[PDB]
Design an enzyme around this catalytic site. Sequence first.
Site, PDB file in Angstrom:
ATOM      1  N   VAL B  49       4.059   8.111  -4.326  1.00  0.00           N
ATOM      2  CA  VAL B  49       4.099   6.927  -3.645  1.00  0.00           C
ATOM      3  C   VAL B  49       4.330   6.584  -2.275  1.00  0.00           C
ATOM      4  O   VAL B  49       4.851   6.995  -1.597  1.00  0.00           O
ATOM      5  CB  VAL B  49       5.820   5.837  -4.543  1.00  0.00           C
ATOM      6  CG1 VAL B  49       5.361   5.091  -5.090  1.00  0.00           C
ATOM      7  CG2 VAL B  49       5.702   7.259  -5.945  1.00  0.00           C
ATOM      8  N   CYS B  50       3.613   5.528  -1.797  1.00  0.00           N
ATOM      9  CA  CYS B  50       2.854   4.306  -0.715  1.00  0.00           C
ATOM     10  C   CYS B  50       4.196   4.101  -0.803  1.00  0.00           C
ATOM     11  O   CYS B  50       5.927   3.650  -1.819  1.00  0.00           O
ATOM     12  CB  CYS B  50       2.658   3.205  -0.785  1.00  0.00           C
ATOM     13  SG  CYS B  50       0.879   3.975  -1.756  1.00  0.00           S
TER      14      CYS B  50
END
Lengths: 170, 176
Positions: B49-50
């Site tokens: 996940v960013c």
Amino acid sequence: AGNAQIGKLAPDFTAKAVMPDGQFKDLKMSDYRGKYVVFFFYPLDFTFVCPTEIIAFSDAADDFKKIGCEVIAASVDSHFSHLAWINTPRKQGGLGTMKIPLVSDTRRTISTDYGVLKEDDGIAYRGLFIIDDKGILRQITINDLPVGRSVEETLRLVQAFQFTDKHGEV
Amino acid sequence: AGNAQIGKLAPDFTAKAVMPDGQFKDLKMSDYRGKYVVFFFYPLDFTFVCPTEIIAFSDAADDFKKIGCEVIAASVDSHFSHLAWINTPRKQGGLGTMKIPLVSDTRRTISTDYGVLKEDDGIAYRGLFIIDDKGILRQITINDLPVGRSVEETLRLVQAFQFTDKHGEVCPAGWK
Ligand SMILES: [Ca+2]
Ligand SMILES: [Ca+2]
Ligand SMILES: [Ca+2]
Ligand SMILES: [Ca+2]
Ligand SMILES: [Ca+2]
């Protein structure tokens, strides 16, 4: 206190509500299974706190309806207090007609289940809960009495949970 | 779970943190008394996940500092794990340099006391907390893992609480 936990079924309950048409009805949380629910508590009826919050949420009822989300308000006041407040027009300090149901928690059991009872006053804190279409709690927001919640933030949250339910981000 | 209650002192702790400059330090919650604190948790370092949400709070650090508020992030990952993540370039998934301390909760006591520990995973939910300058807990926010928080909303709340501390509740004349 409370059974309200993220990822677990929101606590169910049966309680008197003043419906938007002004009629008394027994409302069950599990009756809204199949749609998201914004369940928000306010402390008291009348002017203990400013009524701009409850009003803002009523006026956005249609923004929530558009994305298949019901909005429900609750306090410890009687369903008779709710109706007197709704039947007082806004021009005379009252709530006037509402577009959301007001739930009565006179036994304080729902406030207790959702962890939002301010024990020394016998009153709910400004709690807001987001419940998914399967009855699972996705989001907990509780504020101290002096600061209100945001319709626009609640809308962001509901669409974001709806979105991630069908995708998964990156 | 937890001792975190609206109107009570925010639960105190001492924990290893990676400060903005890159130095390890024993950070204590009660040391931030005299200022407001935004205390938020994230689940894990180095996910796929960013780290948008975490970067966004890093870059708003100054906006909070100006109105007399400190921003602190925490996960159950070690401070060594935090450091590795800041020293990983944003371009290759890393966090890059940070303007807020990352607290380490390897014993999971902080997560437990704030009621944000997901037991079946042993990581924190995306909980965020607003503590006033007397160390009193004013606001609780807990998201399920898929949905992040809003800098802008956190600003509204901090300012709103600061304003009511001085002036009382905002209400229009009459009784709105
Ligand atoms: Ca009561
Ligand atoms: Ca208000
Ligand atoms: Ca070092
Ligand atoms: Ca301050
Ligand atoms: Ca620890």
